[PDB]
Design a protein around this ligand. Structure first.
Ligand SMILES: CC(C)(C)c1ccc(C(=O)Nc2cc(-c3ccccc3)nn2-c2ccccc2)cc1
Length: 288
């Protein structure tokens, strides 16, 4: 809400079970029939609105607008019978924070043990690609963090969420008075102090996403309370270099974390550097 529509017949959606819950809705896994030509049956994630209606139409418009190779695919809505539904792509590894933790200190998509440096960089690059697209359309996320990315088959990583991160990951937010919940640990000085949010508050957040990736999904400033974390951020402390993170990747983080918004590197450059590294041969990466 800070920044055409496909429609799906209720009968074509068959709910299977709940994936998660919140204050403003529930998410289910469902079979969707006649959605794509190739697949006559297919799995999808369905967001059910608690039941509001105006916001829904507006959000649905924007979600349909924002479609990219690294943005969670939105198929359309179901406005036939209440409750209103939003239909998204099903991403089988769930959110990126959960995926990182479950492969940190085997299977179909990933090797045993912690994810190697090349895997971590591929993840980083895809999220960066996603924010390039968003910056290019001049969309400000406001809550970029690994919990708001999803991991699919073949370790495809895409930006997107179902609006329940405040409920599932409540410790990642600071309740400031009543009903406002801020992802302070992911926010730069200008958002905490002045309450400004821009493309460059998002680069900062990406920098913190990069730290999350390289710490296997650990919470930023985990050693601190919320007030202590606000103190450190506003006073200008930068997160330390993760053990798994080599100097050159850490240098990418710091460019995201320049205190002054204009001195931060553009997302396009962050991506270009991370892609290169992700697409670099084992001989070059083994030496990083
Ligand atoms: C990356 C894309 C463009 C796909 C994107 C960007 C932003 C959001 C988003 O803004 N999500 C989001 C936050 C809350 C939210 C709820 C309560 C309090 C504070 C924030 N709801 N939603 C939500 C609502 C309807 C559908 C899906 C997500 C999603 C995707």
């Amino acid at each position: 809400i800070e920044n055409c529509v496909h429609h799906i017949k209720r009968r074509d959606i068959v709910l299977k079970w709940e994936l998660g819950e919140g204050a403003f809705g529930k998410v289910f896994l469902a079979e969707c029939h006649n959605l794509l030509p190739e697949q006559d049956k297919m799995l999808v994630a369905v967001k059910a609105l608690k039941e509001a209606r105006q916001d829904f139409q507006r959000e649905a418009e924007l979600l349909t607008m924002l479609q990219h190779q690294h943005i969670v695919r939105f198929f359309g809505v179901c406005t036939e019978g209440r409750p209103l539904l939003m239909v998204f792509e099903y991403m089988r590894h769930g959110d990126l924070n959960r995926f990182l933790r479950s492969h940190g200190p085997g299977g179909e998509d990933v090797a045993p043990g912690p994810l190697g440096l090349g895997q971590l960089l591929a993840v980083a690059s895809q999220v960066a690609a996603g924010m390039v697209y968003l910056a290019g359309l001049h969309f400000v996320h406001r809550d970029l963090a690994t919990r708001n990315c999803l991991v699919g088959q073949g370790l495809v990583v895409k930006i997107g969420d179902f609006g329940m991160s405040r409920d599932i990951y409540s410790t990642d937010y600071y309740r400031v008075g009543g009903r406002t919940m801020l992802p302070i640990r992911w926010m730069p000085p200008e958002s905490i102090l002045y309450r400004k949010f821009t493309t460059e508050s998002d680069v900062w957040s990406f920098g913190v996403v990069l730290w999350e990736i390289f710490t296997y999904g650990k919470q930023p400033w985990y050693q601190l309370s919320n007030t202590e974390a606000i103190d450190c951020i506003t006073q200008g402390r930068e997160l330390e270099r993760p053990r798994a993170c080599p100097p050159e990747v850490y240098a990418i983080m710091r460019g995201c974390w320049q205190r002054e918004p204009q001195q931060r590197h553009s997302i396009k450059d962050v991506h270009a550097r991370l892609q290169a590294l992700a697409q670099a041969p084992p001989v070059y990466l083994d030496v990083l």
